[PDB]
Scaffold this active site. Structure first.
Site, short mmCIF file in Angstrom:
data_model
loop_
_atom_site.label_atom_id
_atom_site.label_comp_id
_atom_site.label_asym_id
_atom_site.label_seq_id
_atom_site.Cartn_x
_atom_site.Cartn_y
_atom_site.Cartn_z
NE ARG A 149 -1.13 -0.52 4.89
CZ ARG A 149 -1.27 -1.80 5.21
NH1 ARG A 149 -1.79 -2.65 4.33
NH2 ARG A 149 -0.90 -2.23 6.41
CG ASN A 150 3.70 2.23 2.15
OD1 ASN A 150 4.19 1.45 2.96
ND2 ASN A 150 2.73 3.08 2.47
CG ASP A 163 4.98 8.92 1.40
OD1 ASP A 163 4.78 9.81 0.54
OD2 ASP A 163 4.05 8.43 2.09
C1 LIG Z 1 -2.40 9.19 0.17
C2 LIG Z 1 -2.14 8.93 -1.29
O1 LIG Z 1 -1.04 9.73 -1.65
C3 LIG Z 1 -0.70 9.83 -3.01
C4 LIG Z 1 0.54 10.40 -3.35
C5 LIG Z 1 0.91 10.51 -4.69
C6 LIG Z 1 0.04 10.04 -5.71
N1 LIG Z 1 0.15 10.02 -7.05
N2 LIG Z 1 -0.92 9.48 -7.59
C7 LIG Z 1 -1.78 9.11 -6.66
C8 LIG Z 1 -3.13 8.46 -6.97
C9 LIG Z 1 -3.77 7.54 -5.93
C10 LIG Z 1 -5.02 6.91 -6.54
C11 LIG Z 1 -5.19 6.54 -7.89
N3 LIG Z 1 -6.40 6.04 -8.00
N4 LIG Z 1 -7.04 6.05 -6.83
C12 LIG Z 1 -8.40 5.58 -6.63
C13 LIG Z 1 -8.48 4.54 -5.51
O2 LIG Z 1 -9.51 4.36 -4.96
C14 LIG Z 1 -6.25 6.58 -5.92
C15 LIG Z 1 -1.19 9.47 -5.38
C16 LIG Z 1 -1.56 9.37 -4.02
C17 LIG Z 1 -1.93 7.42 -1.47
C18 LIG Z 1 -2.96 6.64 -1.98
CL1 LIG Z 1 -4.52 7.36 -2.44
C19 LIG Z 1 -2.77 5.28 -2.15
N5 LIG Z 1 -1.63 4.72 -1.82
C20 LIG Z 1 -0.63 5.41 -1.33
C21 LIG Z 1 -0.74 6.79 -1.13
CL2 LIG Z 1 0.63 7.71 -0.46
#
Ligand SMILES: C[C@@H](Oc1ccc2[nH]nc(/C=C/c3cnn(CCO)c3)c2c1)c1c(Cl)cncc1Cl
Length: 266
Positions: A149-150, A163
């Site tokens: 999930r990262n 990150d």
């Molecule tokens: C807290 C969030 O920070 C980030 C940081 C940089 C990013 N660049 N691009 C995305 C797109 C995420 C996405 C794309 N599609 N969807 C629909 C999902 O329902 C969500 C994204 C998200 C996160 C999330 Cl959202 C997920 N994992 C890790 C992290 Cl850090």
């Protein structure tokens, strides 16, 4: 408050924001339509992700993070920094956007029914996180959490770690779980849990075990058992990432070769 970097300082004008992406801890992340991020065609358009404050000591964490991505520079298998906005007050941070967002979630959706995601795509998934983790170590940077999930999935099935820097217990290694110490080898442990997170197609580590005597069971030598249809060389690689002695844990450079020698079966 403070200065403006011509290498990264973007005009807020060419940036129309959009709908959020969802977390967390340090700040909120929204989709945003940025214009002209590639100055070859200033008429271009693309979808980047922007990081903001909610409103804070989180203004220090936020700046401390921005400074570090500038340091490491670009790379393929990490979320790269594109630009920033400190000029007219509120702090925006502009980085690459992965549309298939997130891994762990990337797998539980293409999960077949119980009994697309072909085997090589999954080796591709891990071999990319291998290369991204070695780069972070070589730039003397570290990433502790390191779960599925990262890791974010681009439009093209490219894995970009999220990150980095200079409660989630199933992923932590003993020495970090008990002595509260983190080395490059503690990540090699977390990468092994990641390897398992993939070949189960997004499962939960140590399924059905309360996070609590888990330490005692690892204090026996009991690592999770070879996920079904996972060819033994991969579970063999996970067991090596789960060796209690860190000096017997592989380095990331060796996880690159082993996975590359596999990817080359083809
Ligand atoms: C807290 C969030 O920070 C980030 C940081 C940089 C990013 N660049 N691009 C995305 C797109 C995420 C996405 C794309 N599609 N969807 C629909 C999902 O329902 C969500 C994204 C998200 C996160 C999330 Cl959202 C997920 N994992 C890790 C992290 Cl850090």
């Amino acid at each position: 408050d403070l200065p403006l970097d011509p290498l990264w300082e973007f005009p807020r004008d060419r940036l129309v924001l959009g709908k959020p992406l969802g977390e967390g801890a340090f700040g909120q992340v929204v989709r945003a339509e940025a214009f002209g991020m590639d100055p070859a065609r200033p008429d271009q358009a693309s979808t980047v992700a922007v990081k903001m404050l909610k409103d804070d000591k989180d203004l220090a964490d936020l700046v401390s993070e921005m400074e570090v991505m500038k340091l490491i520079g670009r790379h393929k298998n990490i979320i790269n920094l594109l630009g920033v906005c400190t000029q007219e007050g509120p702090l925006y941070v502009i980085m690459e956007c992965a549309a298939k967002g997130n891994l762990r979630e990337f797998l539980r959706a293409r999960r077949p029914p119980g009994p697309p995601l072909s085997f090589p795509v999954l080796v591709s998934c891990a071999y990319q996180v291998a290369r991204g983790m070695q780069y972070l170590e070589s730039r003397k940077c570290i990433h502790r959490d390191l779960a599925a999930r990262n890791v974010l999935v681009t439009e093209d099935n490219v894995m970009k770690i999220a990150d980095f820097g200079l409660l989630p217990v199933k992923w932590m290694a003993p020495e970090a779980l008990f002595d509260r110490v983190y080395t490059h080898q503690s990540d090699v442990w977390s990468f092994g849990i990641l390897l398992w997170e993939i070949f189960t197609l997004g499962g939960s580590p140590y399924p059905g075990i309360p996070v609590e005597e888990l330490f005692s069971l690892l204090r026996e030598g009991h690592r999770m058992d070879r996920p079904p249809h996972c060819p033994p060389e991969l579970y063999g690689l996970m067991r090596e990432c789960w060796h209690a002695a860190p000096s017997q844990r592989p380095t990331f450079k060796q996880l690159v070769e082993a996975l590359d020698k596999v990817l080359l079966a083809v």
